[PDB]
Amino acid sequence: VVGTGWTSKGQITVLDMHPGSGKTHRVLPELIRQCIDRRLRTLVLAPTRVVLKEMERALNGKRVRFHSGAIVDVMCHATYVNRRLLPQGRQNWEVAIMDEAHWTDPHSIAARGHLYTLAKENKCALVLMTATPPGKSEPFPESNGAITSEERQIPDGEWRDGFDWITEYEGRTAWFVPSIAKGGAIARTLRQKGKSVICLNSKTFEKDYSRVRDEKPDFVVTTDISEMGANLDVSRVIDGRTNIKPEEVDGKVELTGTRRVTTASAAQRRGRVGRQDGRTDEYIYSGQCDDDDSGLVQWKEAQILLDNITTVATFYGPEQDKMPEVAGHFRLTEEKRKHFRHLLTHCDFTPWLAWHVAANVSSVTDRSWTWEGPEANAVDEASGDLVTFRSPNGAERTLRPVWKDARMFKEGRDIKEFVAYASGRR
Numbered sequence: 001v002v003g004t005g006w007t008s009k010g011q012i013t014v015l016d017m018h019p020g021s022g023k024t025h026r027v028l029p030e031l032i033r034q035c036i037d038r039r040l041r042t043l044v045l046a047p048t049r050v051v052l053k054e055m056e057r058a059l060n061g062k063r064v065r066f067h068s069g070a071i072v073d074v075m076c077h078a079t080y081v082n083r084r085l086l087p088q089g090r091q092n093w094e095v096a097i098m099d100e101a102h103w104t105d106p107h108s109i110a111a112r113g114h115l116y117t118l119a120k121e122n123k124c125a126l127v128l129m130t131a132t133p134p135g136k137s138e139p140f141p142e143s144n145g146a147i148t149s150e151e152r153q154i155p156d157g158e159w160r161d162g163f164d165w166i167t168e169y170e171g172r173t174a175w176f177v178p179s180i181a182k183g184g185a186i187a188r189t190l191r192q193k194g195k196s197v198i199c200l201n202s203k204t205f206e207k208d209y210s211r212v213r214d215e216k217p218d219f220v221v222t223t224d225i226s227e228m229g230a231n232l233d234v235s236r237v238i239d240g241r242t243n244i245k246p247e248e249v250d251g252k253v254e255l256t257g258t259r260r261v262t263t264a265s266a267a268q269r270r271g272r273v274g275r276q277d278g279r280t281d282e283y284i285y286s287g288q289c290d291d292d293d294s295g296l297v298q299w300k301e302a303q304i305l306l307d308n309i310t311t312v313a314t315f316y317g318p319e320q321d322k323m324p325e326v327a328g329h330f331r332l333t334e335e336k337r338k339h340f341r342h343l344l345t346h347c348d349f350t351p352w353l354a355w356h357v358a359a360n361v362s363s364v365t366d367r368s369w370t371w372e373g374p375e376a377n378a379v380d381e382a383s384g385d386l387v388t389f390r391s392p393n394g395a396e397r398t399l400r401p402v403w404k405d406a407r408m409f410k411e412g413r414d415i416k417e418f419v420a421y422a423s424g425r426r
Protein backbone atom coordinates (compact mmCIF):
# COMPACT_ATOMS: atom_id res chain seq x y z
CA VAL A 1 0.00 0.00 0.00
CA VAL A 2 2.93 2.36 0.91
CA GLY A 3 6.20 1.97 -1.08
CA THR A 4 8.88 3.90 0.91
CA GLY A 5 9.22 7.23 2.83
CA TRP A 6 6.38 6.06 5.11
CA THR A 7 9.31 5.80 7.54
CA SER A 8 10.19 9.47 7.11
CA LYS A 9 10.07 11.66 10.23
CA GLY A 10 6.65 13.32 10.36
CA GLN A 11 4.84 10.83 8.11
CA ILE A 12 1.55 9.67 9.72
CA THR A 13 0.17 6.77 7.70
CA VAL A 14 -3.29 5.40 8.50
CA LEU A 15 -3.69 1.79 7.35
CA ASP A 16 -7.51 1.63 7.35
CA MET A 17 -7.78 -1.63 5.42
CA HIS A 18 -11.07 -3.48 6.06
CA PRO A 19 -11.12 -6.18 8.86
CA GLY A 20 -9.18 -9.40 8.08
CA SER A 21 -7.26 -7.45 5.33
CA GLY A 22 -3.97 -8.89 6.69
CA LYS A 23 -2.77 -5.88 8.73
CA THR A 24 -1.53 -8.04 11.61
CA HIS A 25 -0.39 -11.18 9.83
CA ARG A 26 0.85 -9.91 6.44
CA VAL A 27 1.42 -6.12 6.40
CA LEU A 28 3.07 -5.85 9.84
CA PRO A 29 5.85 -8.47 9.25
CA GLU A 30 6.66 -6.67 5.98
CA LEU A 31 6.93 -3.31 7.68
CA ILE A 32 9.34 -4.86 10.20
CA ARG A 33 11.42 -6.54 7.47
CA GLN A 34 11.83 -3.07 5.94
CA CYS A 35 12.68 -1.37 9.27
CA ILE A 36 15.40 -3.97 9.98
CA ASP A 37 16.76 -3.56 6.43
CA ARG A 38 17.01 0.24 6.70
CA ARG A 39 18.32 -0.11 10.30
CA LEU A 40 15.58 2.13 11.80
CA ARG A 41 14.76 1.92 15.53
CA THR A 42 11.17 0.62 15.57
CA LEU A 43 8.44 0.35 18.24
CA VAL A 44 5.49 -2.02 17.61
CA LEU A 45 2.48 -1.62 19.99
CA ALA A 46 0.10 -4.61 20.37
CA PRO A 47 -3.23 -4.16 22.25
CA THR A 48 -3.00 -7.32 24.39
CA ARG A 49 -0.68 -10.16 25.40
CA VAL A 50 -2.67 -12.52 23.17
CA VAL A 51 -1.91 -10.35 20.12
CA LEU A 52 1.72 -9.85 21.37
CA LYS A 53 2.16 -13.64 21.59
CA GLU A 54 0.79 -14.03 18.05
CA MET A 55 3.16 -11.34 16.74
CA GLU A 56 5.97 -13.34 18.43
CA ARG A 57 5.16 -16.39 16.29
CA ALA A 58 4.70 -14.34 13.08
CA LEU A 59 8.08 -12.57 13.63
CA ASN A 60 11.09 -14.88 13.88
CA GLY A 61 13.28 -11.77 13.47
CA LYS A 62 16.77 -11.63 14.95
CA ARG A 63 16.48 -7.88 15.53
CA VAL A 64 13.14 -8.11 17.42
CA ARG A 65 12.73 -7.75 21.21
CA PHE A 66 9.41 -8.67 22.93
CA HIS A 67 8.60 -6.87 26.20
CA SER A 68 6.55 -8.35 29.08
CA GLY A 69 21.27 -6.14 19.99
CA ALA A 70 17.79 -5.83 18.45
CA ILE A 71 16.38 -2.55 17.04
CA VAL A 72 12.65 -3.44 17.00
CA ASP A 73 10.76 -3.44 20.31
CA VAL A 74 7.31 -5.11 20.51
CA MET A 75 5.21 -4.31 23.62
CA CYS A 76 1.53 -3.72 24.62
CA HIS A 77 -0.13 -0.31 24.33
CA ALA A 78 -0.23 -0.17 28.15
CA THR A 79 3.44 -1.20 28.62
CA TYR A 80 4.64 1.75 26.45
CA VAL A 81 2.59 4.27 28.42
CA ASN A 82 3.41 2.75 31.81
CA ARG A 83 7.17 2.77 31.23
CA ARG A 84 7.01 6.48 30.28
CA LEU A 85 5.54 7.17 33.75
CA LEU A 86 9.14 6.70 35.07
CA PRO A 87 11.10 9.89 33.93
CA GLN A 88 13.89 7.28 34.04
CA GLY A 89 13.37 4.92 31.01
CA ARG A 90 11.86 7.08 28.17
CA GLN A 91 13.80 5.37 25.30
CA ASN A 92 13.23 6.66 21.73
CA TRP A 93 12.12 5.28 18.36
CA GLU A 94 12.00 6.79 14.89
CA VAL A 95 9.29 4.46 13.63
CA ALA A 96 6.20 3.59 15.71
CA ILE A 97 3.59 1.10 14.47
CA MET A 98 0.40 0.82 16.57
CA ASP A 99 -1.85 -2.21 15.85
CA GLU A 100 -5.59 -2.18 16.63
CA ALA A 101 -5.28 1.60 17.08
CA HIS A 102 -9.02 2.29 17.51
CA TRP A 103 -9.05 0.95 21.10
CA THR A 104 -10.71 3.43 23.49
CA ASP A 105 -8.86 1.99 26.55
CA PRO A 106 -7.24 5.02 28.29
CA HIS A 107 -3.71 3.62 27.76
CA SER A 108 -4.39 3.15 23.97
CA ILE A 109 -5.89 6.67 23.67
CA ALA A 110 -2.85 8.03 25.53
CA ALA A 111 -0.32 6.05 23.46
CA ARG A 112 -1.67 7.07 20.05
CA GLY A 113 -2.00 10.61 21.43
CA HIS A 114 1.61 10.77 22.51
CA LEU A 115 2.85 9.24 19.26
CA TYR A 116 0.69 11.59 17.14
CA THR A 117 2.17 14.48 19.16
CA LEU A 118 5.76 13.38 18.42
CA ALA A 119 5.10 12.90 14.68
CA LYS A 120 3.37 16.32 14.50
CA GLU A 121 6.74 17.60 15.80
CA ASN A 122 8.71 15.42 13.38
CA LYS A 123 10.50 13.30 16.01
CA CYS A 124 9.15 10.08 14.46
CA ALA A 125 7.03 8.31 11.81
CA LEU A 126 3.69 6.81 12.95
CA VAL A 127 1.73 3.94 11.46
CA LEU A 128 -1.81 3.36 12.84
CA MET A 129 -3.28 0.04 11.69
CA THR A 130 -7.05 -0.40 12.23
CA ALA A 131 -10.19 -1.29 10.31
CA THR A 132 -11.88 1.65 12.09
CA PRO A 133 -9.59 4.72 12.37
CA PRO A 134 -10.80 7.53 14.69
CA GLY A 135 -13.04 9.87 12.70
CA LYS A 136 -15.71 8.70 10.25
CA SER A 137 -16.78 5.08 10.78
CA GLU A 138 -19.08 2.76 8.85
CA PRO A 139 -21.09 -0.05 10.56
CA PHE A 140 -21.04 -2.56 7.69
CA PRO A 141 -17.48 -2.35 6.14
CA GLU A 142 -16.12 -4.84 3.58
CA SER A 143 -15.00 -8.37 4.65
CA ASN A 144 -12.94 -11.28 3.13
CA GLY A 145 -16.22 -13.21 2.77
CA ALA A 146 -19.90 -12.23 2.66
CA ILE A 147 -21.77 -11.36 5.80
CA THR A 148 -25.55 -11.46 5.99
CA SER A 149 -26.53 -8.72 8.50
CA GLU A 150 -30.06 -8.82 9.97
CA GLU A 151 -31.76 -6.85 12.76
CA ARG A 152 -33.68 -9.07 15.24
CA GLN A 153 -34.71 -8.62 18.86
CA ILE A 154 -31.96 -10.02 21.10
CA PRO A 155 -32.46 -11.24 24.73
CA ASP A 156 -31.04 -8.80 27.28
CA GLY A 157 -30.90 -11.45 30.01
CA GLU A 158 -32.46 -14.85 30.76
CA TRP A 159 -35.27 -16.03 28.46
CA ARG A 160 -37.43 -19.12 27.95
CA ASP A 161 -39.00 -19.13 24.48
CA GLY A 162 -39.57 -17.03 21.35
CA PHE A 163 -35.86 -16.86 20.40
CA ASP A 164 -35.52 -20.36 18.89
CA TRP A 165 -33.31 -19.00 16.09
CA ILE A 166 -30.62 -18.74 18.83
CA THR A 167 -30.46 -22.42 19.76
CA GLU A 168 -31.55 -23.99 16.43
CA TYR A 169 -28.50 -22.55 14.66
CA GLU A 170 -26.03 -25.16 13.52
CA GLY A 171 -22.57 -23.53 13.79
CA ARG A 172 -20.55 -21.66 16.47
CA THR A 173 -21.64 -18.19 17.72
CA ALA A 174 -19.94 -15.19 19.36
CA TRP A 175 -22.49 -13.21 21.44
CA PHE A 176 -21.34 -9.71 22.52
CA VAL A 177 -22.66 -8.43 25.86
CA PRO A 178 -22.25 -5.00 27.54
CA SER A 179 -20.92 -6.25 30.95
CA ILE A 180 -19.64 -9.33 32.76
CA ALA A 181 -22.88 -9.52 34.77
CA LYS A 182 -25.08 -9.57 31.64
CA GLY A 183 -22.62 -12.13 30.25
CA GLY A 184 -23.34 -14.39 33.25
CA ALA A 185 -27.12 -14.30 32.71
CA ILE A 186 -26.85 -15.09 28.93
CA ALA A 187 -24.35 -17.90 29.58
CA ARG A 188 -26.50 -19.54 32.29
CA THR A 189 -29.57 -19.63 29.99
CA LEU A 190 -27.57 -21.12 27.11
CA ARG A 191 -26.20 -23.88 29.35
CA GLN A 192 -29.77 -24.68 30.53
CA LYS A 193 -30.59 -25.18 26.84
CA GLY A 194 -27.72 -27.70 26.52
CA LYS A 195 -25.26 -25.39 24.75
CA SER A 196 -21.55 -25.22 25.70
CA VAL A 197 -20.38 -21.65 26.55
CA ILE A 198 -17.10 -19.97 27.36
CA CYS A 199 -17.20 -16.39 28.71
CA LEU A 200 -14.53 -13.89 27.69
CA ASN A 201 -14.02 -10.45 29.27
CA SER A 202 -11.37 -8.07 30.78
CA LYS A 203 -10.92 -10.70 33.50
CA THR A 204 -10.75 -13.96 31.51
CA PHE A 205 -9.39 -12.92 28.09
CA GLU A 206 -5.59 -13.18 28.51
CA LYS A 207 -6.12 -16.57 30.20
CA ASP A 208 -9.13 -18.02 28.32
CA TYR A 209 -8.86 -16.91 24.75
CA SER A 210 -6.95 -20.18 24.16
CA ARG A 211 -9.86 -22.43 25.31
CA VAL A 212 -12.11 -21.21 22.43
CA ARG A 213 -9.93 -22.81 19.74
CA ASP A 214 -9.27 -25.85 21.93
CA GLU A 215 -12.82 -26.68 23.07
CA LYS A 216 -14.96 -25.28 20.22
CA PRO A 217 -17.86 -24.04 22.41
CA ASP A 218 -21.30 -23.66 20.82
CA PHE A 219 -21.16 -20.03 22.07
CA VAL A 220 -18.52 -17.49 23.14
CA VAL A 221 -20.18 -14.84 25.34
CA THR A 222 -17.81 -11.88 25.28
CA THR A 223 -17.51 -8.22 26.26
CA ASP A 224 -15.91 -5.62 23.92
CA ILE A 225 -12.49 -7.03 24.74
CA SER A 226 -12.79 -9.25 21.59
CA GLU A 227 -12.99 -6.06 19.43
CA MET A 228 -9.15 -5.83 19.25
CA GLY A 229 -7.91 -8.74 17.11
CA ALA A 230 -9.47 -11.88 18.71
CA ASN A 231 -10.14 -14.72 16.20
CA LEU A 232 -13.09 -16.61 17.68
CA ASP A 233 -13.51 -18.89 14.63
CA VAL A 234 -17.30 -18.54 14.53
CA SER A 235 -19.89 -18.31 11.71
CA ARG A 236 -22.34 -15.97 13.54
CA VAL A 237 -22.14 -12.89 15.80
CA ILE A 238 -25.06 -11.86 17.98
CA ASP A 239 -24.74 -8.21 18.93
CA GLY A 240 -27.21 -6.12 20.98
CA ARG A 241 -24.88 -3.16 20.33
CA THR A 242 -24.63 -2.05 23.95
CA ASN A 243 -21.70 -1.31 26.21
CA ILE A 244 -21.20 -0.44 29.87
CA LYS A 245 -20.83 3.27 30.55
CA PRO A 246 -18.12 4.17 33.15
CA GLU A 247 -18.83 7.88 33.82
CA GLU A 248 -17.70 10.47 36.36
CA VAL A 249 -20.89 11.73 38.06
CA ASP A 250 -20.82 14.08 41.06
CA GLY A 251 -17.10 13.41 41.70
CA LYS A 252 -17.56 9.57 41.67
CA VAL A 253 -17.15 6.97 38.88
CA GLU A 254 -20.44 5.10 38.33
CA LEU A 255 -21.14 1.94 36.32
CA THR A 256 -24.94 1.99 35.82
CA GLY A 257 -26.90 1.26 32.65
CA THR A 258 -25.53 0.97 29.13
CA ARG A 259 -24.79 3.16 26.14
CA ARG A 260 -25.16 2.25 22.45
CA VAL A 261 -21.84 1.12 20.94
CA THR A 262 -19.94 3.49 18.65
CA THR A 263 -20.07 2.59 14.95
CA ALA A 264 -16.41 1.59 15.22
CA SER A 265 -17.31 -0.98 17.92
CA ALA A 266 -20.30 -2.29 15.88
CA ALA A 267 -17.94 -2.68 12.88
CA GLN A 268 -15.36 -4.53 15.00
CA ARG A 269 -17.89 -6.89 16.57
CA ARG A 270 -19.34 -7.65 13.09
CA GLY A 271 -15.67 -8.02 12.02
CA ARG A 272 -15.27 -11.20 14.06
CA VAL A 273 -17.01 -13.01 11.15
CA GLY A 274 -16.59 -12.75 7.37
CA ARG A 275 -12.89 -13.45 7.72
CA GLN A 276 -12.79 -16.34 5.19
CA ASP A 277 -13.12 -16.21 1.38
CA GLY A 278 -15.88 -18.49 0.00
CA ARG A 279 -18.15 -18.69 3.08
CA THR A 280 -21.05 -16.52 4.16
CA ASP A 281 -21.34 -15.66 7.87
CA GLU A 282 -24.17 -13.98 9.81
CA TYR A 283 -24.19 -10.80 11.90
CA ILE A 284 -27.38 -10.56 14.02
CA TYR A 285 -27.73 -7.11 15.63
CA SER A 286 -30.38 -5.06 17.42
CA GLY A 287 -30.81 -1.23 17.20
CA GLN A 288 -28.38 1.52 16.13
CA CYS A 289 -24.96 3.05 17.07
CA ASP A 290 -23.92 6.30 18.84
CA ASP A 291 -20.50 7.81 18.08
CA ASP A 292 -20.71 10.38 20.84
CA ASP A 293 -18.76 8.63 23.64
CA SER A 294 -17.31 11.98 24.85
CA GLY A 295 -19.09 11.62 28.22
CA LEU A 296 -17.04 8.51 29.20
CA VAL A 297 -14.34 8.69 31.93
CA GLN A 298 -11.87 7.06 29.47
CA TRP A 299 -11.07 10.52 27.93
CA LYS A 300 -10.22 11.99 31.30
CA GLU A 301 -8.19 8.86 32.19
CA ALA A 302 -6.42 9.16 28.83
CA GLN A 303 -5.51 12.76 29.66
CA ILE A 304 -4.36 11.77 33.17
CA LEU A 305 -1.92 9.33 31.54
CA LEU A 306 -0.88 11.55 28.60
CA ASP A 307 -0.28 14.56 30.92
CA ASN A 308 2.11 12.37 32.95
CA ILE A 309 4.13 10.90 30.03
CA THR A 310 5.06 14.31 28.58
CA THR A 311 7.28 17.15 29.88
CA VAL A 312 1.87 20.67 24.35
CA ALA A 313 0.62 17.10 23.67
CA THR A 314 -2.74 16.36 22.03
CA PHE A 315 -4.79 13.17 21.51
CA TYR A 316 -4.64 11.70 18.02
CA GLY A 317 -6.24 14.02 15.42
CA PRO A 318 -10.08 13.91 15.71
CA GLU A 319 -10.08 12.69 19.35
CA GLN A 320 -8.59 16.02 20.51
CA ASP A 321 -12.20 17.30 20.78
CA LYS A 322 -12.74 14.84 23.60
CA MET A 323 -9.80 15.82 25.86
CA PRO A 324 -11.79 17.20 28.88
CA GLU A 325 -9.25 19.79 30.17
CA VAL A 326 -6.43 21.94 28.69
CA ALA A 327 -3.27 19.86 28.13
CA GLY A 328 -1.13 19.41 31.26
CA HIS A 329 -4.03 19.84 33.75
CA PHE A 330 -3.35 16.41 35.30
CA ARG A 331 0.50 16.60 35.34
CA LEU A 332 1.85 15.44 38.71
CA THR A 333 5.19 16.22 40.38
CA GLU A 334 7.86 13.51 39.93
CA GLU A 335 7.42 12.11 43.44
CA LYS A 336 3.62 11.99 43.07
CA ARG A 337 3.89 10.42 39.59
CA LYS A 338 5.88 7.61 41.18
CA HIS A 339 3.03 6.99 43.64
CA PHE A 340 0.58 7.15 40.69
CA ARG A 341 2.62 4.57 38.73
CA HIS A 342 2.88 2.15 41.68
CA LEU A 343 -0.92 2.35 42.22
CA LEU A 344 -1.49 1.53 38.51
CA THR A 345 1.00 -1.30 38.03
CA HIS A 346 1.10 -2.85 41.52
CA CYS A 347 -2.31 -2.23 43.05
CA ASP A 348 -4.49 -2.59 39.92
CA PHE A 349 -5.99 0.96 40.42
CA THR A 350 -7.94 2.62 37.59
CA PRO A 351 -6.02 5.70 36.29
CA TRP A 352 -8.86 7.85 37.71
CA LEU A 353 -8.51 6.49 41.21
CA ALA A 354 -4.66 6.37 41.13
CA TRP A 355 -4.54 10.05 40.09
CA HIS A 356 -6.90 11.25 42.86
CA VAL A 357 -5.01 9.26 45.50
CA ALA A 358 -1.54 10.27 44.23
CA ALA A 359 -2.46 13.96 43.82
CA ASN A 360 -4.18 14.40 47.18
CA VAL A 361 -2.70 12.02 49.78
CA SER A 362 0.30 12.98 51.97
CA SER A 363 2.35 9.77 51.90
CA VAL A 364 2.47 6.46 50.03
CA THR A 365 1.74 4.59 53.28
CA ASP A 366 -1.52 6.30 54.31
CA ARG A 367 -4.65 4.09 54.08
CA SER A 368 -7.07 6.34 56.05
CA TRP A 369 -8.41 7.75 52.74
CA THR A 370 -10.13 4.35 52.31
CA TRP A 371 -12.35 4.87 55.42
CA GLU A 372 -12.60 8.68 55.86
CA GLY A 373 -14.79 9.47 52.82
CA PRO A 374 -18.44 10.65 52.97
CA GLU A 375 -20.96 8.11 54.35
CA ALA A 376 -22.64 7.71 50.92
CA ASN A 377 -19.27 6.33 49.66
CA ALA A 378 -19.42 3.21 51.90
CA VAL A 379 -19.12 -0.03 49.93
CA ASP A 380 -21.59 -2.87 50.51
CA GLU A 381 -21.31 -6.64 49.97
CA ALA A 382 -24.11 -7.92 47.72
CA SER A 383 -25.63 -9.24 51.01
CA GLY A 384 -26.23 -5.55 52.00
CA ASP A 385 -23.90 -5.22 55.00
CA LEU A 386 -21.19 -2.60 54.52
CA VAL A 387 -17.66 -3.95 54.04
CA THR A 388 -15.50 -3.85 57.21
CA PHE A 389 -11.81 -4.71 57.72
CA ARG A 390 -8.98 -4.31 60.29
CA SER A 391 -6.10 -1.83 60.12
CA PRO A 392 -2.75 -3.22 61.47
CA ASN A 393 -3.47 -1.73 64.94
CA GLY A 394 -6.57 -3.97 65.06
CA ALA A 395 -9.07 -1.06 64.66
CA GLU A 396 -12.32 -1.89 62.81
CA ARG A 397 -12.88 0.18 59.59
CA THR A 398 -15.85 0.47 57.24
CA LEU A 399 -14.60 0.66 53.60
CA ARG A 400 -15.71 4.19 52.72
CA PRO A 401 -13.15 5.76 50.36
CA VAL A 402 -12.71 9.52 49.78
CA TRP A 403 -12.62 8.72 46.03
CA LYS A 404 -15.20 6.12 44.95
CA ASP A 405 -14.68 4.35 41.60
CA ALA A 406 -17.36 1.65 41.07
CA ARG A 407 -14.90 -0.25 38.91
CA MET A 408 -12.80 -1.28 41.92
CA PHE A 409 -15.69 -3.30 43.39
CA LYS A 410 -17.17 -5.22 40.40
CA GLU A 411 -16.83 -5.90 36.64
CA GLY A 412 -13.68 -7.98 36.96
CA ARG A 413 -12.30 -6.51 40.21
CA ASP A 414 -13.19 -8.00 43.65
CA ILE A 415 -13.68 -6.05 46.93
CA LYS A 416 -11.25 -8.63 48.45
CA GLU A 417 -8.21 -7.20 46.57
CA PHE A 418 -9.07 -3.60 47.46
CA VAL A 419 -9.39 -4.70 51.13
CA ALA A 420 -5.84 -6.12 50.91
CA TYR A 421 -4.68 -2.60 49.94
CA ALA A 422 -6.94 -0.80 52.45
CA SER A 423 -5.78 -2.96 55.39
CA GLY A 424 -2.12 -2.15 54.58
CA ARG A 425 -1.26 -5.75 53.51
CA ARG A 426 -0.63 -4.52 49.95
Ligand SMILES: Nc1ncnc2c1ncn2[C@@H]1O[C@H](COP(=O)(O)OP(=O)(O)O)[C@@H](O)[C@H]1O
Binding pocket: 017, 018, 019, 020, 021, 022, 023, 024, 025, 026, 144, 231, 275, 276, 277
Ligand atom coordinates in the same frame (compact mmCIF):
# COMPACT_ATOMS: atom_id res chain seq x y z
N1 LIG B 1 -2.20 -18.16 11.26
C1 LIG B 1 -3.06 -17.18 10.96
N2 LIG B 1 -3.39 -16.28 11.92
C2 LIG B 1 -4.25 -15.30 11.62
N3 LIG B 1 -4.87 -15.06 10.46
C3 LIG B 1 -4.53 -15.96 9.53
C4 LIG B 1 -3.66 -17.03 9.69
N4 LIG B 1 -3.55 -17.75 8.50
C5 LIG B 1 -4.34 -17.13 7.66
N5 LIG B 1 -4.97 -16.03 8.22
C6 LIG B 1 -5.90 -15.15 7.53
O1 LIG B 1 -5.53 -13.80 7.71
C7 LIG B 1 -6.72 -12.97 7.47
C8 LIG B 1 -6.81 -11.90 8.56
O2 LIG B 1 -5.43 -11.40 8.70
P1 LIG B 1 -5.15 -10.27 9.78
O3 LIG B 1 -3.73 -9.83 9.65
O4 LIG B 1 -5.59 -10.75 11.13
O5 LIG B 1 -6.15 -9.11 9.30
P2 LIG B 1 -6.52 -7.65 9.90
O6 LIG B 1 -5.40 -7.39 10.87
O7 LIG B 1 -6.56 -6.62 8.79
O8 LIG B 1 -7.88 -7.77 10.58
C9 LIG B 1 -7.90 -13.94 7.40
O9 LIG B 1 -8.28 -14.15 6.04
C10 LIG B 1 -7.34 -15.22 8.03
O10 LIG B 1 -8.03 -16.38 7.61
Ligand SMILES: [Mn+2]
Binding pocket: 023, 024, 099, 100, 229
Ligand atom coordinates in the same frame (compact mmCIF):
# COMPACT_ATOMS: atom_id res chain seq x y z
MN1 LIG C 1 -5.62 -6.69 13.06
